[PDB]
């Protein structure tokens, strides 16, 4: 059981060595679309790419290139789209990424400005009368209404495909409090978060993929997705204890590299799924 092994890696401290070892096991793949010097200024991180077999392609013939990921977690059914906090020449192709693939969620895990730089260019509406036309990718999009709280914005958008007058309400779910440094010091605020996404609707089967970034979508983006997982292989399971937190992100790491940035980012993943699973037992 994962709360004896936390315990354990904790009081020898080998958070460092555990993550060490994850890093050596990682899957390495092909990413040769994304490195394509025609794709330059479609990539925030020049060492984050998705691999040519689980990348996202846009339904555009010119260029079909976006920084994102399909992470298919056969065993859990559930589906997510990792994705870069896009770029100011991007912010059409994210929005025809989640037309395409019919998503009815986004979860950004980032402030559009941490440490003051910009990790996100602002790619939804601030006011209901003030929508946003992208050109390039023919959609508009709407703020229909806003719910600040605490430690999450949830955003109702209708983005509309010019093309074909076809509306769409998409969610939009902010978590606004991510410290600029290190992790959340307890996990209640984000399991919150998580729960709220998932009484949405977003992760469900009826739906596209959620798309989750933070700015390279790897670190934070790798938590959310890992704790939603393990929860829900904890409830699908004849003995909830088989669940091995490693084995699944190493699953989660042959879709997109990285996923998990720091051995922090690692521990705060055990603690969420550890408390999770109280209320979920």
């Not at 790798?222 to 393990?230: E, H, I, S, V, Y």
């Amino acid at each position: 059981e994962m709360e004896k092994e936390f315990e354990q890696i904790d009081k020898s401290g080998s958070w460092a060595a555990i993550y060490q070892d994850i890093r050596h096991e990682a899957s390495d793949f092909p990413s040769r679309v994304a490195k394509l010097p025609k794709n330059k200024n479609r990539n925030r991180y020049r060492d984050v790419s998705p691999f040519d077999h689980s990348r996202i392609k846009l339904h555009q013939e010119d260029n079909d290139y976006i920084n994102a990921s399909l992470i298919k977690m056969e065993e859990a059914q559930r589906s997510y789209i990792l994705t870069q906090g896009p770029l100011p020449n991007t912010v059409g192709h994210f929005w025809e990424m989640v037309w395409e693939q019919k998503s009815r969620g986004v979860v950004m895990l980032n402030r559009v400005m941490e440490k003051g730089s910009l990790k996100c260019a602002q790619y939804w509406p601030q006011k209901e009368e003030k929508e946003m036309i992208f050109e390039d990718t023919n959609l508009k999009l709407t703020l229909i209404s806003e719910d600040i709280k605490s430690y999450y914005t949830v955003r109702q958008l209708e983005l509309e495909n010019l093309t074909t007058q076809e509306t769409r309400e998409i969610l939009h779910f902010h978590y606004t409090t991510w410290p600029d440094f290190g992790v959340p010091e307890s996990p209640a605020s984000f399991l919150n978060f998580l729960f709220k996404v998932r009484e949405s609707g977003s992760l469900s089967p009826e739906h596209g993929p959620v798309v989750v970034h933070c700015s390279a979508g790897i670190g934070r983006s790798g938590t959310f997705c890992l704790a939603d997982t393990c929860l829900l292989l904890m409830d699908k399971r004849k003995d909830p204890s088989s669940v091995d937190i490693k084995k699944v992100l190493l699953e989660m790491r042959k879709f997109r590299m990285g996923l998990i940035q720091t051995a922090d980012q690692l521990r705060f993943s055990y603690l969420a799924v550890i408390e999770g699973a109280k209320f979920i037992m």
